Write a protein that binds this ligand. Structure first.
Ligand SMILES: Cc1cn([C@H]2C[C@H](OP(=O)(O)O)[C@@H](COP(=O)(O)O)O2)c(=O)[nH]c1=O
Ligand SMILES: [Ca+2]
Length: 129
């Protein structure tokens, strides 16, 4: 896999971000995680966490996996990095997202995220409290 440039257009919620990619605006849904919706417990805190990450970073990047690059809703499907930190791993490590939506062609970083989730679960963080 490889990282590609993108620029923040705007943070949306815990696991969706609008980015400019190859000069075109698109909504990206983070691969391999599920954050609560904003109206659910820990949703605002997830949305806040992701917003800070992607806004504060000097450099946001996208990384497609090996399978589908867009979902049925036209959202891009990628891992997102903020100054080289994977947004998925940060959220999961903090108990603000669960590993989820692990589909067969697009699961390169599953075990990294599962490891992070196990540590969050151990610490009883947020969603696991
Ligand atoms: C993360 C991800 C979600 N999706 C689809 C499955 C779910 O469809 P349904 O809407 O049909 O439940 C939906 C969940 O996204 P949200 O968690 O953003 O709602 O997005 C994929 O198709 N591929 C993926 O990699
Ligand atoms: Ca969600």
């Amino acid at each position: 896999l490889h990282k590609e440039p993108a620029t923040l257009i705007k943070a949306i919620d815990g696991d969706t971000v609008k980015l400019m990619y190859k000069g075109q605006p698109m909504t990206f849904r983070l691969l391999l995680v599920d954050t609560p919706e904003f109206n659910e417990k820990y949703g605002p805190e997830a949305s806040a966490f992701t917003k800070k990450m992607v806004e504060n970073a000097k450099k946001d990047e996208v990384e497609f996996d090996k399978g589908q690059r867009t979902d049925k809703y036209g959202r891009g499907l990628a891992y997102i990095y903020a100054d080289g930190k994977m947004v998925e791993e940060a959220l999961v490590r903090q108990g603000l997202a669960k590993v989820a939506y692990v589909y067969k062609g697009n699961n390169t970083h599953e075990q990294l995220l599962r490891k992070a989730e196990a540590q969050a679960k151990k610490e009883k963080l947020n969603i696991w409290s």
